[PDB]
């Protein structure tokens, strides 16, 4: 689709239209501090094209916003390559938010979820997070309306054993949380329950097909999900493959190469040879 940069959206909602054609945000997305906004600015607004965030997602003090079901309906993976504190999703002092509605979110690789101080917010205990996050031990969901034992939560849907009882799992009144059979793992499945291809991540339009993933599990290159970037391609942003040329062009006006990865910085013990961008170990001590 489109790959755009990590963005930081504040004050006027109008900045939000930068994302219109975007499919993957390479980096993080932060939408915050909007105090004059009203429900009606959101009841006609959507980003069905956003499928993936590489780093983290953070919503904070966005008023008038009541569900995310129309805003990011098709966001499916958050990869958490870089985290906010230790979180890959932060929902914080989101006054007005009632329900989450990320019914397409299937996996948060790496990070944890922190959803705090959201009076109004329910449909939280109706989510099985362990089907989405690797580590839920570090989840931090407190001080929401859900913690008043007094939530009008209603959903068909399936139940998991999180307590000492099974619990129906859904995002909104009209969307179930999708659960793939245990043995599909993270790879996703069709509505019937045929596992997607093993190099796919959350979902697929067709089964058994590495070009028909909705979000690559390992790395993306030339339409296909692959296990690893072959030379002459390099690991970038830890989700996609690129050639030397791409990596170089970005460096010049601070990207470098090491371990067959294209990265901002040489790691310790290494200095950057100028002829080839390749990090080399130091002759004696490293000035760096």
């Amino acid at each position, epitope marked *: 689709g489109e790959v755009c940069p990590g963005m930081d959206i504040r004050n006027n909602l109008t900045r939000l239209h930068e994302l219109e054609n975007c499919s993957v945000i390479e980096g993080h997305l932060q939408i915050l501090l909007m105090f004059k906004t009203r429900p009606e600015d959101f009841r006609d607004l959507s980003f069905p094209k956003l499928i993936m965030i590489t780093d983290y997602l953070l919503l904070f003090r966005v008023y008038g916003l009541e569900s995310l079901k129309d805003l990011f309906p098709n966001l499916t993976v958050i990869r958490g390559s870089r985290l906010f504190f230790n979180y890959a999703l932060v929902i914080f002092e989101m006054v007005h938010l009632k329900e989450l509605g990320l019914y397409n979110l299937m996996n948060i690789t790496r990070g944890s979820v922190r959803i705090e101080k959201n009076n109004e917010l329910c449909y939280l205990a109706t989510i099985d997070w362990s089907r989405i996050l690797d580590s839920v031990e570090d989840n931090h969901i407190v001080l929401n309306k859900d913690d008043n034992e007094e939530c009008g939560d209603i959903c068909n849907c399936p139940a998991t054993v999180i307590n000492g009882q099974f619990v129906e799992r859904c995002w909104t009144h009209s969307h179930c949380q999708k659960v793939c059979p245990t043995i599909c793992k993270s790879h996703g499945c069709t509505a019937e329950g045929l596992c997607c291809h093993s*190099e796919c991540l959350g979902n697929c339009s067709q089964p058994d097909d*590495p*070009t028909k993933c909705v979000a690559c599990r390992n*790395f993306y*290159l*030339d*339409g*296909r*999900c*692959v*296990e*690893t*970037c*072959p*030379p*002459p391609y390099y*690991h970038f942003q830890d989700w996609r*493959c690129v050639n030397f040329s791409f990596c170089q062009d970005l460096h010049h006006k601070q990207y470098v190469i090491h*371990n*067959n*990865k294209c990265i901002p910085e040489c790691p310790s013990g290494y200095t950057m040879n100028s002829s080839n961008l390749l990090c080399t170990p130091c002759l004696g001590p490293c000035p760096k």
Partner: antibody
């Protein structure tokens, strides 16, 4: 339905060029690589070249521009074109698929015989 | 392209036994970024086109029996067939797919009667 089938002319007189069409079906050429390998009867299997998803090309250095590999992805065809052949080029030619990132060479053609 | 060399040119064996043939490259084939070696083994039952067996020198392809066992790392490789069954007769080749691809000189399996 992953399939490759080679269309060779079969017979070529010396000093003339070789044009083979590998017709693949069941996958998109924009997303996989295609290799060419030949074998003279009961002799070695010989890597000739490959064309990646993005149009990029690899050739055996032995082939001094004797080899040109190009593609028509809209009509699912891969073209090998090799100039001025001699009798030591008498071999069976295969194209085979290449899931580069994830696999090496899965799915082979049945092979086409070419004699000089 | 680099240069690959096998041994032997051919071998012979009978039913029940384990078998190991060799290969070598002029340059190291271990990929740093994932710790996998970029080498393949293919079986070619004779007269028919070859078939994919083992990639990353240890990953078994779908539809391959567990009797087939790939080994080695760096520049030096070997392929192992544990317990021979009748039609296991084939010529086996090593392919590097690290940079470009080149195949080994190949090595033949024959059976005793």
């Amino acid at each position: 339905q992953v399939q490759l089938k080679e269309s060779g002319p079969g017979l070529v007189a010396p000093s003339q060029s070789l044009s083979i069409t590998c017709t693949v079906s069941g996958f998109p050429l924009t997303a996989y690589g295609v290799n060419w390998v030949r074998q003279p009867p009961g002799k070695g299997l010989e890597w000739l070249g490959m064309i990646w998803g993005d149009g990029n090309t690899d050739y055996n250095s032995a082939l001094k521009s004797r080899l040109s590999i190009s593609k028509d992805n809209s009509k699912s065809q891969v073209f090998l074109k090799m100039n001025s052949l001699q009798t030591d080029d008498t071999a069976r030619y295969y194209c085979a698929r290449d899931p580069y990132g994830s696999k090496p060479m899965d799915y082979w053609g049945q092979g086409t015989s070419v004699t000089v | 392209d680099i240069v690959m060399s096998q041994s032997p040119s051919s071998l012979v064996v009978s039913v029940g036994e384990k078998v190991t043939m060799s290969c070598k490259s002029s340059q190291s084939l271990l990929y740093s970024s994932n710790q996998k070696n970029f080498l393949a083994w293919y079986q070619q039952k004779p007269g028919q086109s070859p078939k994919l067996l083992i990639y990353w020198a240890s990953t078994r392809e779908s539809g391959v029996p567990d009797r087939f066992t790939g080994s080695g790392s760096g520049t030096d490789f070997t392929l192992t067939i544990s317990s021979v069954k009748a039609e296991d007769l084939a010529v086996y080749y090593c392919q590097q797919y690290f940079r470009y691809r080149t195949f080994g000189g190949g090595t033949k399996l024959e059976i005793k009667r």
